[PDB]
Amino acid sequence: EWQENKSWNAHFTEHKSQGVVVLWNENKQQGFTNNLKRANQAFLPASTFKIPNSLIALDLGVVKDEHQVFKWDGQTRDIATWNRDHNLITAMKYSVVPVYQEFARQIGEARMSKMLHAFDYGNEDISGNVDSFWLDGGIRISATEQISFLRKLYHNKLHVSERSQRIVKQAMLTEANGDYIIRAKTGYSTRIEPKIGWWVGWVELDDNVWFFAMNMDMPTSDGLGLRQAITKEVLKQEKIIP
Numbered sequence: 001e002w003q004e005n006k007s008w009n010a011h012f013t014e015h016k017s018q019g020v021v022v023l024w025n026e027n028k029q030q031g032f033t034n035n036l037k038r039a040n041q042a043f044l045p046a047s048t049f050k051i052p053n054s055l056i057a058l059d060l061g062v063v064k065d066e067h068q069v070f071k072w073d074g075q076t077r078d079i080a081t082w083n084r085d086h087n088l089i090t091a092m093k094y095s096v097v098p099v100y101q102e103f104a105r106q107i108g109e110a111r112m113s114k115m116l117h118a119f120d121y122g123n124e125d126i127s128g129n130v131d132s133f134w135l136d137g138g139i140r141i142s143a144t145e146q147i148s149f150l151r152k153l154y155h156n157k158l159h160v161s162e163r164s165q166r167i168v169k170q171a172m173l174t175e176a177n178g179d180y181i182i183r184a185k186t187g188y189s190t191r192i193e194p195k196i197g198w199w200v201g202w203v204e205l206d207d208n209v210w211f212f213a214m215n216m217d218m219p220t221s222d223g224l225g226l227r228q229a230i231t232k233e234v235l236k237q238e239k240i241i242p
């Protein structure tokens, strides 16, 4: 069952913004959100798509393992951290689009389409260019649909090998301390309106797991830090993390 708490809207409006946070308590099988409608509205996944893309690349052998080096192609781009060699871990960490565009080209349209259907991922629609459809093509996914997909990944239930799923969860590692572990991926969609930022993932505790998926209006890049900051403030308010 689902509960809506409209008072949580203050986390976004206090920053002159609008968005949705969706939380899922795995032990209790209960969900919570500030806005049930927006929780089910589908947006471009943008760099959150690097989760399924990594899985497919690993399972087909396009990527050998998390140490394989993807050499910079020598084209200077405006994100300094993209102008260097990467492996799967650093490509995830710095959301290196051109590395994942090469993954998608080697995966190919037919295998990509099949695998997203097998994952039940969003609207499963890869219309557009095979190396950019998650940025400006036809694929869409909602916050609740992100949760459904992430829960399968957590439980090793996606239709790829256990190894592929373990490696991607390693690459999602974002934060860890004595109190919790966060595995997550950010996203920033700008090529189609409305411009939004994403943060999706989960929080591991000693005896429970809380899945989360959030998106928020993002008219400029100045607010990107709000994706993680707001989410962690909700988690702290609900006493999930200290």
Ligand SMILES: O=C(O)c1cccc(-c2ccccn2)c1
Residues within 6 Å of the ligand: 047, 079, 081, 082, 093, 094, 095, 186, 187, 188, 224
């Ligand atoms: O948060 C994001 O989704 C995002 C979007 C665009 C660029 C970068 C970035 C900046 C510095 C180093 C690496 N990547 C991150």
